[PDB]
Amino acid sequence: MFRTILVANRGEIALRVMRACRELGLRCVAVYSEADRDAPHVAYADDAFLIGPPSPAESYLNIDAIIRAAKATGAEAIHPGYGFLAENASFVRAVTAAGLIFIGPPAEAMERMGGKTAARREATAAGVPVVPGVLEPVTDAAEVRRLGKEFGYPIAIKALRVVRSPEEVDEAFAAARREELYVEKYLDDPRHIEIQVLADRYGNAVALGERDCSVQRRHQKLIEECPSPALTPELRAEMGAAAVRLAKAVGYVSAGTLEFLFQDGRYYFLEMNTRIQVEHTVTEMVYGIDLVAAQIRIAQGEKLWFKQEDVVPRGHAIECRINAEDPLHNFRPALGTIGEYHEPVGFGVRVDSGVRAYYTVPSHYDSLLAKLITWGSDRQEAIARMRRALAEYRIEGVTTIIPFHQAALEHPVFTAGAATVNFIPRHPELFSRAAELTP
Amino acid sequence: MFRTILVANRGEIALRVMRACRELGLRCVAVYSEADRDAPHVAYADDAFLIGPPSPAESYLNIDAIIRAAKATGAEAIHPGYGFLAENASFVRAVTAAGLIFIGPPAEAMERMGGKTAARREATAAGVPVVPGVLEPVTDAAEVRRLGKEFGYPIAIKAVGLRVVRSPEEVDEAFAAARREAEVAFKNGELYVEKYLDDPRHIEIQVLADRYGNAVALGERDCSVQRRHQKLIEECPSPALTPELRAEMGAAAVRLAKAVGYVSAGTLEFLFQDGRYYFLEMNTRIQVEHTVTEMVYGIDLVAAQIRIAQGEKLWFKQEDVVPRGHAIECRINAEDPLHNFRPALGTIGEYHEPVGFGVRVDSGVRAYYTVPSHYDSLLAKLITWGSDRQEAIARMRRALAEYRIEGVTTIIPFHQAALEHPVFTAGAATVNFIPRHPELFSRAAELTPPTAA
Amino acid sequence: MFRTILVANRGEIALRVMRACRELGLRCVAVYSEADRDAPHVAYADDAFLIGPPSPAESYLNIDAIIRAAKATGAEAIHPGYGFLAENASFVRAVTAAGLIFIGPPAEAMERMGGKTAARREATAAGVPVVPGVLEPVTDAAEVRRLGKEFGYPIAIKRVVRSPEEVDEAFAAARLYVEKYLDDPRHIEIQVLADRYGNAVALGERDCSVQRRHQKLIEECPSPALTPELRAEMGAAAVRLAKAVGYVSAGTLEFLFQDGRYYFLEMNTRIQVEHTVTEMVYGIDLVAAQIRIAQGEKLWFKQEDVVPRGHAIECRINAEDPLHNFRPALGTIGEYHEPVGFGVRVDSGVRAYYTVPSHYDSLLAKLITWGSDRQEAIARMRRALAEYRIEGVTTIIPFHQAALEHPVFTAGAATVNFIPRHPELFSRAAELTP
Amino acid sequence: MFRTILVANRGEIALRVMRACRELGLRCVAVYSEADRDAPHVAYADDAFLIGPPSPAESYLNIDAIIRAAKATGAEAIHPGYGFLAENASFVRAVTAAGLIFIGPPAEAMERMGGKTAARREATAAGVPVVPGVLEPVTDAAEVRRLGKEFGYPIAIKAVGGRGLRVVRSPEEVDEAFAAARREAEVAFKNGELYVEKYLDDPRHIEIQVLADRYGNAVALGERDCSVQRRHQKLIEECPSPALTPELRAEMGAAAVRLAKAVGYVSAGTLEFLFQDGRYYFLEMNTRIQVEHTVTEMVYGIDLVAAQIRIAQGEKLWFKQEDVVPRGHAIECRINAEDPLHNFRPALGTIGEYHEPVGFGVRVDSGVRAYYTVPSHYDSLLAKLITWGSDRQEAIARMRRALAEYRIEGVTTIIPFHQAALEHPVFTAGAATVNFIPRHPELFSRAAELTPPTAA
Amino acid sequence: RRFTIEVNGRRFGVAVFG
Amino acid sequence: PAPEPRRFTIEVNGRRFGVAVFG
Amino acid sequence: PRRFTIEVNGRRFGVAVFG
Amino acid sequence: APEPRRFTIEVNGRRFGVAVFG
């Protein structure tokens, strides 16, 4: 049993984890770069330490600095949060050698699921479907055709080109050589479905549902919801069971997320995030579980206090990321000073934030100012609450993508539950409405 | 089907209803006295109207004034909230004659359950237990003795309790003292007898009904921790109830609700001691503590009232009513816990409300706001939800500590002390929690910080 | 045939006659008292003469002064107008003796119709009904009852007696004369135009019953109470009476109409203040007709050519306070804006920034509207009343607006007792007054 | 049944329509450009709206602006008045599509009678005589002669120039005229194409008023003589015309009603004819109220603007042709604020002192007031002076008095011209033709004699 | 104190009683 | 505190209104 | 920029006059 | 012809445009 834990992060997650520490009767220690000296998470924590200059490399990604902070403040365990050193096995090994407990997966499990190729092997060994593909370079155009019959068109050549017919493979191979290749199956309109897993040191694992993080811009998420409207009760069980299987095979011991691609009733594994998830909030509100508190207990050696039969979804939750970007100008980073800050309030409204009023947003690190989460009895309620909260969230001085969120939540495709990975590309009318909602 | 509704209330509740209106896509209109011109609910609403001077009788209790405001603002329905005119049948009838919809029970049901005596009689029908009593003037000490055996000692003598009688011999002295006291103070001198419960618990059942006779029970609430007879902390579920007792009480509540012709939300309050529950009275309105039931059963009661007012049949059945987790609410009243909960006045300087998962704040104040004195003490309500009771208590403790309300004294220290008390931690809080544990105030003082305006 | 005409009057009527003079190519000479030096009719006229001080007795009623003005100004005939030496045979005799033409009836005819008793005698001859009455004093109560049988109850002692029993007590209370009493009569008058050569025509009726204390306020043509049958009979009676008396020029025979029966009261010997409604409905210039008859033209039309078209109503804009018993109001008018439009006529004697002489009448102007049907005339009059701007002095225009909204007036049941029986008029009048 | 009406016009006519609204208990809404902000019509109205910039195309001819104004003010019907969009079918269709009632004829009737060519075709179909002419191009001089035989000399050669490029009275003159007309059109008009029409030496302009209801009932409300005109713009109008006989009045009225019913007409309209030597010829139909409706309005005792509104609400005609009876005579003189003696060149300025004539049988329909700056961007008509009499002589005398006693100080008006004409022996006799002004220049000498000096 | 005011086109005659 | 308002009576096209302006 | 609160016959209206 | 005073007034989020004369 450890009494004080050090949070090796900043912003939203740092404050979120500290709240969990306070509730569990634990002491939280903050770490900050010179840019984050006057930051919200530093004031909230019981203790603070200056780990280095603003560059992420010399602060927040500095293993030696974080270990030093834990020693100076007396911390006995470290919660990585998400990002930086959260998925770095080396940091885990340094943390264990110093005598401190890592509030996360073990080092060896982190490594086995680190690389996309390594993860694919571990998922096939555990009977989780993967995207049909060849790991080695493709020698000639004929192999593309034969691989095309085996997988089923459309297929895609990567180092890029999408080929819909066997005839088109002749030209596409020519173009790909111009720009040494490999082939994988291509999904026209997939959905990003991910499964949350919680495990303990003693091999007990549970699947805490799905999340549809499909509204994405350039592979960067913007809206997340739980449950996913596209999954059926049978698919949910199969994917959850598969997730627990892969987790047990790698020896997982903390909270984790398995990301899949879902198209035409079939799901394919892509990557595993061996950390807490940014959008764990939607899962937390629907299944009524404190995941960060759960991480701390399982790290303390507690055996899982519940079973899969106890995991029950109630309601629907949506999360909009308040990123500081220009929705009207290709989401270009927006920086500046926040003047007036007023968070929306009400039943079923949650704001996990890393900013305050009269705060100059560090230009380094992330664009995430805060995360707005709403819960409702049904999805329609959750959408209605999110629309009110977005309107009544006041962030002055800095540009936010809140207009985009408001337009998306009004879009018929989102209302109907047809949000795909191509939601933003296929409907550019969102930005016209977003333009209408800006000052 | 109406599009704009007027909220005939102030402070916390008025904002609570307005948020529901906004979520349902409806326009909300606010009414305010001269004191609440700078109040949060006036700024929040889509429209507002000045109904009168700070006096409650000339403002929020003015039936004709409220109706006139609704016409000027175009309101088609009125939400009474939880105080002024919410349980006044006259206000309902004025609203009906003006052509507007009352977002609450019908007038006739409201009347039948209005008086404590009337509610008790309606409860004797429909087979709901009531406090064993006479309620009719007792003539002499001998009748008290016979009624004492029938009800079972202890019993209590009351007037139109004054004294509690534990033995048959004790009845003559108490009857004499109780009569003189009534005559001198209440100019009545006529008494009645009721059974006395030494260490009861205040347990209430929430019921929702539709215009079409479908009624459902949305669980229990423990409102045991009270000063005087005013609730300070409420939690759901109650640790004293068993699953079977919970169902039995819910069934009684729906039976009583249906017999009276109830529509909308309401709350039936019981007294619980030694495994037995007794009906006292029914509140024909939304309850201030509806928040905890909302967190455990995942239902928006204010939205539910609006739907039932628009004529929808209940969209769920008793099988759908399922509790998840535990919710506790500590009422942030502006009073000095260390000096007989004396009213506290002033202007709120710096206001920062707690945040997090499972933390809810329904407030009627803001930073740099002068709190009106003419009304209540409730500045806001701090509500937390957890996976289990321990989680809810921890979040309530963190939120209580991290609630910053500067310039005015609140009972926030008292609350923290209570949530440390071993009796509370077990769930043995009875109505006489504060009276029997005066060590709470010691702890309160230690957590009371030095303050300045 | 004369070329210069003198108008021995002031104000509204004086301007009206002059307009007729100009249209006929004739010269207008005005007469004015010291009060009316800055008056509209003196400015309008081709010539003017100062007849005396403001007192009516010493100015507009001075026969010698008017004859003096005619000589000095070169006038060859004089038009009396209404209300000043009009119906004065003495003025006619002076005017005829002075070598001038009197634009009106001849003196002998004017005299025969002057007094109410004298006119009644001339009216019983020629078969015109009169109010059943006794001209001599009533000796005892028995005669009243006997007079009650002859006339038919109700009767009036000069108190109203409804039965023979009430006559016994009522006769005691008054201590006379007795005449039949009409409970709710209507004031109906008939227009007559006559020729020097014995030609006479009846130009219709007028209902001037909206009246306070025997003073007319609203006048309309035709009367809603008259039927075509009554109209012919009454007009014929009017022409019959005129021919017996030797009438010349314009005249008005006033009757009382009750329960389908009409009774003669008086004959006004000159032009009528409310002649305007008749002019608008029958399309005749009566003042021009008077001038032509004066130079000797024979009537240019016959009764068959007299045809009514439309309905006309006239409101008198009187300088009086309706809210306070029509009390003369005086002062100076600041801004004057007259209502205008199709079917709106304003005969006025005031202007903007004019101080109203107090020594005379209260008539500031007369507002007349015409419509296709009575309803148009009511709507047109209501608009004109609203858009009449008289800012310095109080007028009875609010009373007019209330009356024209009243249900009884809308239906055409206004009687001589209209104002007494409906005091709600003054409540409505107060609302439109500020 | 509608309660608020929007008047899409300015000046005299707008006030005239609004007064009709007030009497009928209806609300009138005014539209105004920036120039007419301080205009009388704006103030009279119950409500008002800026239609746009002083440019007519951007204001009173801007269809969307008028409809938008009606929506903001709550108007349910639109009265076009005379001019602007009153005969514009596009405006009618736009108003119908917006849910508003057009107080006028339906779009289809308006279109069928819009162009001069279409109307004459519709008039021959309904058995209304038209000016004998061939609208297709005439190739050679021989066709002119043949067309001259059929039409009857004189005839007039014109080019596709409304008035004859040349008038030929004999067959012999056609060779010279045809040559002369071709160059003139080629060089200037730019099209050698000509056509031939019958020529009337001394015609009279006689027009017939037609009123119809939505249910096919149509009535003829008499004639008007609008002969005294400068250029082709009317200056004096009278009712009845002295040249018509009682029989011709009915014959023409019947023809007018035939055409109106045949085209499906609704509301008020005016059919214009040319009258010479006992013969009448149709020219064009105005699908609107006529500026000179006042004279008919006073002679037949009908409020045509009120009548337009009633039939617009769907009332069936409340009278029959037997009820249409003329009484008396009416004349209208246009106070056009232009300089006589200077070829009626527009006169502008600010009106200082304004005193309108008053009396029995005098009506003044005005769009100006005292101390008013007269906008230059539109019309020249300040007001219309109308008089009624028992006979024509009376009406003329009243017009003579009213003209003298009309006081307009800041601006020049043609009031002297009116006074000279009303004294002219030809006008007194009722012989005024379309060539009245050209043939008698003594009018302008007398006008100078009666013209007060205006200075600056 | 009388002025004329044009709210988005609509003419209104106002009169402020200070 | 509580600065008193400025109260005016405004007649718009003949309609009397009671206006209170704050600040 | 210039923000006031106005109560027209009771109804609260939030005004902003700008310029 | 005095020129008007033109403001943009936002009342409860509704932008009206006003023009005052005199």
Numbering used by the authors:
A (entry chain D): 1 to 159, 168 to 187, 196 to 455
B (entry chain B): 1 to 160, 167 to 459
C (entry chain C): 1 to 158, 169 to 185, 197 to 455
D (entry chain A): 1 to 160, 164 to 459
E (entry chain H): 470 to 487
F (entry chain E): 465 to 487
G (entry chain G): 469 to 487
H (entry chain F): 466 to 487
Sentences reproduced from the published study:
Here, we identify a previously unrecognized C. aurantiacus BC1 that possesses fused BC and BCCP domains, enabling it to exhibit both biotin carboxylase and biotin carrier activities. Crystal structures of BC1 and BC2 at 3.2 Å and 3.0 Å resolutions, respectively, have revealed a BC1 tetramer consisting of two BC1-BC homodimers connected by an eight-stranded β-barrel of the BCCP domain. Although we identified a complete BCCP domain (Ala459-Lys596) in C. aurantiacus BC1, the crystal structure only resolved an N-terminal β-hairpin (Pro466-Gly487) that composed of two antiparallel β-strands. The BC/β-barrel interface was mediated by a symmetrically distributed hydrogen bonding network, which was composed of amino acid residues Glu475, Gly478, Arg479, and Arg480 from the β-hairpin, Tyr32, Arg37, Asp47, Leu50 and Ala72 from the N-terminal sub-domain. Each β-hairpin was stabilized by hydrogen bonding interactions between Phe486-Thr473, Glu475-Ala484, and Asn477-Gly482 amino acid pairs. Specifically, truncation of the amino acid residues that constitute the entire BCCP domain (BC1ΔBCCP, Met1-Glu452) or the β-hairpin (BC1ΔBCCPβ-hairpin, Thr473-Gly486) resulted in a dimer of the BC1 mutants. These results indicated that the β-hairpin but not the BCCP core mediated the formation of BC1 tetramer. Overall, these results demonstrated that the β-hairpin mediated tetramer formation is necessary for maintaining effective biotin carboxylase activity of BC1. In the modeled BC1-BC active site, bicarbonate was immobilized through hydrogen bonds with the carboxyl oxygen of Glu295 (2.8 Å), which is conserved with Glu296 in E. coli BC that plays a role in stabilizing the bicarbonate during catalysis.
Acetyl-CoA carboxylases (ACCs) convert acetyl-CoA to malonyl-CoA, a key step in fatty acid biosynthesis and autotrophic carbon fixation pathways. Here, we identify two BC isoforms (BC1 and BC2) from Chloroflexus aurantiacus, a filamentous anoxygenic phototroph that employs 3-hydroxypropionate (3-HP) bi-cycle rather than Calvin cycle for autotrophic carbon fixation. To investigate the structural basis of BC1 as a bi-functional enzyme, we determined the crystal structures of BC1 and BC2 at 3.2 Å and 3.0 Å resolutions, respectively.
